[PDB]
Design a protein around this nucleic acid. Structure first.
Lengths: 216, 95, 51, 19, 31, 102, 251
RNA sequence: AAGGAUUGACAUUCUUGAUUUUGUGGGUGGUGGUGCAUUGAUGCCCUUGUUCUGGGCCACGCGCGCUACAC
């Protein structure tokens, strides 16, 4: 029961890795921006020192491979970059584990722009256009992950919504700052636990809420 | 850890073709990335912030490392690699 | 729980000593080790050719 | 207090030497 | 302060003079 | 050997450029000190002692006599006016809300 | 004969890089034989640095006659050799800032560069480059008006249309002479050059950028022949905006 | 504002002449890449690039004794 965006009836959990930072650069050769591997390039570009981190979404592979809802099939991952770019992933991509192979998977952002498999029947990674709401299911809950929002158990939060046909969570995969709350889709923010969680542990807490709500 | 002649590294699946095969072992078992991304998850979990957790690790070579809750493990990978080299050879890391 | 940052040197080498930030105490420690090994080798050699 | 901000970079020896 | 430094440099010049008066070497031995 | 190749070639062409620039500055200095007022010998032996232009000057003087002007600075639509009006309204309303809240 | 250190001056100014200038070649204004001495230096060879500082001193001693003496014989055509021999057509910042230092004295700058650039060899790419370097920096206003006058009375070339288009998105405050010049530009393009030529989108955007705000000295018969101008030359991008400027302009 | 603006400075003292000069305002700045026929308001990323100063090498190990460091 694989899940694309084009069967908007069924019950899904949509994660939106929002305000990501994976950005390409031209050195003959093609690199992408890490804070660790180059800082003089950030200073010459005049960027902020801190927010050139695709390590956060590469660590948020764990919601793609959060097995007891992804091996149930009921999860789907979209990514929206600070460069305004929406990347779909398929719920059966076996993502590259190491960051050097994830660095090598910049052909989706630069060259190939949609990857096939070795037998090449189902597309894995896509560079689709905005908004997210059109690709979401018909009824869809309106949730971003803030900190100073009211805290609630995501078990009870998913359980009290009887059949809202999905649950979408906009998680800001940035270093510092503030996510687009009133800009696009979310009128109410649900806060997770009492501490300033990182993006990866926020996604994992919501994924495990979905597991123990929908009985893995 | 391993020597290059001048340099010390932590054994990856990716920093070498056959340093692991020269040492005898196979390359699939030299994965420090997964204990890195476990250590990140455990030390960003809320139970660690609440102070109800501590993280011990034990290497396949039989080396036990105690990991304080108060530590800030670095977020990228090769920063953690350079941390693990000095931990494995100086047996201690201060703040 | 408070969260401290770990102090460690980048491109660590155990066989080299630590980079002390003073060039007049690291230098005296270097040249103390140098005189100790050269004095030991020197007087070892002169007592064994005396033998 | 490091709320996911990451521990900072430390300048290299040659970068501090070029001064 | 730097008196240790300069007496130590003259000490090792004394020692290298001493070695070169006889037939010694630097570090040259074989494991 | 690759880094020595880059360093050696750059130092070689850098020394060539420095030698050429020093030679050109030395040539400028010597030619100055032998031809600045040393050309006072040749300063006396060998010496040397428009209708469309008037039309252009006539048009310039006629515009200087009488001219006129251009309305205002731009040309754009009332749809862009409504967009910029809603933009200024939203910016000033959120700015007043931020000033109230803090 | 001349004092003939000019072999040394030409040898160093072939590949001059940086530094100070020979002061005989600095006070070459106050000696009476400047053209006759550069005719025996013969600098077909050039450095772009001495192009820049030499045109600085040449502005310091150019009139109509001096501009005819140096700039209208070898230096304008050296700029032409630079643009044709630049294979990616990269006219350098050296040459451009030489033009921007050159643009200062407006006394006969028309015959300095704008008269001999419509001689031959001006394509639309060199034309948009020359209009760009004209629209970059300071200009004489009355000579811009006079320039629009004579370049519009000049024969029809698409280089001159993009020249005049840049000179009208200068966003001037237009004299009567140039407004009458533009209404006889419409009287110049009639069934003129409507059966002998056709005018695509570049000519279209030229007169649309004219009609953007160049309408504040226009009475109703001028509105009527602009109305049948767009009625003859109906494109897709005329209707609301040129009807808007027709309802927007005044007398 | 030549009864003096700015240009060239023979270190202070004369060879250029409205390009003015100063405010008040204000247009962003195109030597760009990418399908189309090889000149065509074309979907999609950038504007505010010239001349000198660039380097660590392929404090040795082991070990007995002694000394530090513990309400």
């Amino acid at each position: 029961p694989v899940l694309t965006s084009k069967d908007k009836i069924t019950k899904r959990m949509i994660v939106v890795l929002a305000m990501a930072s994976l950005e390409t650069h031209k050195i003959d050769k093609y690199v992408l921006l890490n804070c660790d591997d180059h800082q003089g390039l950030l200073k010459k570009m005049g960027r902020d020192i801190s927010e050139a981190r695709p390590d956060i979404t590469h660590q948020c592979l764990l919601t793609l491979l959060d097995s007891p809802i992804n091996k149930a099939g009921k999860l789907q991952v979209y990514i929206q970059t600070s460069r305004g770019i929406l990347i779909e992933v398929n719920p059966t991509v076996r993502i590259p584990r190491t960051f050097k192979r994830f660095s090598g998977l910049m052909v989706q952002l630069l060259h190939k722009l949609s990857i096939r498999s070795v037998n090449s029947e189902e597309k894995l990674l896509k560079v689709i256009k905005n908004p997210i709401t059109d690709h979401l299911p018909t009824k869809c809950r309106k949730v971003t992950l803030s900190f100073d929002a009211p805290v609630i158990r995501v078990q009870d939060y998913i359980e009290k919504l009887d059949d809202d046909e999905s649950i979408c969570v906009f998680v800001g995969a940035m270093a510092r700052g503030k996510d687009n709350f009133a800009d696009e889709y979310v009128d109410e923010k649900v806060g997770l636990s009492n501490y300033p969680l990182s993006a990866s542990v926020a996604c994992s807490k919501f994924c495990h809420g979905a597991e123990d709500a929908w009985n893995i | 850890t391993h020597k290059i002649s001048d340099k010390y590294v932590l054994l990856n699946c990716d920093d070498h073709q056959g340093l692991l095969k020269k040492m005898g072992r196979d390359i699939s078992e030299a994965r420090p990335d997964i204990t890195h991304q476990c250590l990140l998850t455990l030390l960003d979990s809320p139970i660690n912030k609440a102070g109800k957790l501590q993280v011990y690790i034990q290497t396949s070579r039989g080396i036990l490392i105690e990991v304080n809750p108060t530590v800030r493990i670095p977020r990228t990978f090769k920063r953690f690699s350079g941390l693990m080299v000095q931990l494995l050879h100086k047996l201690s890391i201060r703040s | 729980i408070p969260t401290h940052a770990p102090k460690y040197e980048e491109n660590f080498n155990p066989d080299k000593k630590s980079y002390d930030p003073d060039r007049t105490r690291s230098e005296i420690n270097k040249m103390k080790a140098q005189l100790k090994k050269e004095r030991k080798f020197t007087m070892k050699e002169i007592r064994k050719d005396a033998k | 207090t490091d709320r996911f901000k990451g521990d900072d970079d430390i300048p290299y020896k040659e970068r501090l030497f070029e001064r | 302060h730097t008196l240790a430094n300069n007496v130590e440099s003259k000490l090792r010049d004394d020692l290298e003079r001493l070695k070169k008066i006889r037939a010694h070497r630097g570090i040259r031995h074989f494991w | 050997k690759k880094t020595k190749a880059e360093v050696m070639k750059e130092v070689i062409a850098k020394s060539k450029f420095y030698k050429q620039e020093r030679q050109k500055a030395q040539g400028i200095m010597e030619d100055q000190i032998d031809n600045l007022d040393d050309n006072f010998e040749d300063v006396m032996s060998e010496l040397m002692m428009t209708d469309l232009d008037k039309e252009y000057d006539i048009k310039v003087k006629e515009l200087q006599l009488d001219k006129r002007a251009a309305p205002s600075d731009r040309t754009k639509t009332e749809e862009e006016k409504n967009a910029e009006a809603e933009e200024k309204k939203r910016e000033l309303e959120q700015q007043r809300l931020d000033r109230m809240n803090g | 004969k001349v004092i003939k250190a000019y072999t040394t001056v030409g040898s160093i100014l072939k590949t001059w890089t940086h530094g100070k200038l020979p002061k005989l070649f600095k006070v070459i204004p106050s000696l009476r034989n400047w053209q006759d001495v550069i005719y025996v230096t013969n600098p077909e060879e050039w450095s772009p640095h001495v192009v820049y500082e030499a045109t600085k001193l040449f502005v310091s001693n150019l009139t109509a006659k001096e501009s005819q003496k140096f700039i209208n014989l070898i230096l304008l055509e050296r700029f032409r050799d630079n643009i044709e021999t630049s294979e990616d057509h990269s006219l350098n910042y050296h040459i451009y800032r030489a033009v921007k230092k050159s643009l200062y004295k407006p006394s006969a700058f028309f015959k300095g560069f704008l008269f001999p650039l419509v001689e031959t060899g001006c394509n639309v790419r060199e034309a948009t480059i020359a209009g760009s370097v004209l629209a970059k920096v300071s200009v004489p206003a009355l000579h811009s008006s006079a320039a629009l006058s004579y370049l519009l009375r000049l024969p029809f070339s698409p280089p001159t249309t993009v020249f005049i288009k840049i000179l009208l998105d200068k966003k001037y405050a237009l004299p009567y002479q140039t407004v009458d010049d533009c209404v006889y530009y419409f009287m110049r393009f009639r069934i003129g050059e409507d059966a002998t030529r056709v005018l695509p989108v570049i000519w279209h955007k030229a007169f649309l950028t004219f009609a953007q705000r160049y309408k504040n000295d226009i009475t109703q018969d001028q509105r009527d022949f602009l109305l049948e101008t767009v009625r003859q030359r109906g494109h897709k991008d005329i209707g609301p905006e040129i009807r808007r400027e027709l309802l927007a302009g005044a007398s």
